[PDB]
From Swiss-Prot:
Function: As part of the pyruvate dehydrogenase complex, catalyzes the transfers of an acetyl group to a lipoic acid moiety. The pyruvate dehydrogenase complex, catalyzes the overall conversion of pyruvate to acetyl-CoA and CO(2), and thereby links cytoplasmic glycolysis and the mitochondrial tricarboxylic acid (TCA) cycle.
The family this protein is said to belong to: Belongs to the 2-oxoacid dehydrogenase family.
Annotated compartments: Mitochondrion matrix
UniProt domain Lipoyl-binding: residue ranges: 9-85
The name this protein goes by in its record: Dihydrolipoyllysine-residue acetyltransferase component of pyruvate dehydrogenase complex, mitochondrial
Organism placement in taxonomy: Eukaryota, Metazoa, Chordata, Craniata, Vertebrata
Gene label: DLAT
Disease implication from the record: Primary biliary cirrhosis is a chronic, progressive cholestatic liver disease characterized by the presence of antimitochondrial autoantibodies in patients' serum. It manifests with inflammatory obliteration of intra-hepatic bile duct, leading to liver cell damage and cirrhosis. Patients with primary biliary cirrhosis show autoantibodies against the E2 component of pyruvate dehydrogenase complex.
Organism: Homo sapiens (Human)
Modified residues (N6-lipoyllysine): K50
Length: 106
């Protein structure tokens, strides 16, 4: 009985759609490179003077494409700064493959 639906993809842009303004810049959300949260991580706290967006990373925030740290001014919405996902990380060349797939042929 897990609970999953559609793949994750935190658009670098701030998901506001109603910042009450048209010129907001990331205020504070310096995540830690390759972070990883599963109980509510930080969130791009954007602000302008009468509103502030927030990239609430509900249980997530592995810092995948975090390139624009708080301070970049693009807008109170589209302002794309980083793509969150909470990746688990996993590297390993492994050019050989003794086995084939995960289908254990009876």
């Amino acid at each position: 009985g897990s609970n999953m639906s559609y793949p994750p993809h935190m658009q670098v842009l701030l998901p506001a759609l109603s910042p009450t303004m048209t010129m907001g810049t990331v205020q504070r959300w310096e995540k830690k490179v390759g972070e990883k949260l599963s109980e509510g991580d930080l969130l791009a706290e954007i602000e302008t003077d009468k509103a502030t967006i927030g990239f609430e990373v509900q249980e997530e925030g592995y810092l995948a494409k975090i390139l624009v740290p708080e301070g970049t001014r693009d807008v109170p919405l589209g302002t794309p700064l980083c793509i969150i996902v909470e990746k688990e990380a996993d590297i390993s060349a492994f050019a050989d493959y003794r086995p084939t797939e995960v289908t254990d042929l009876k």
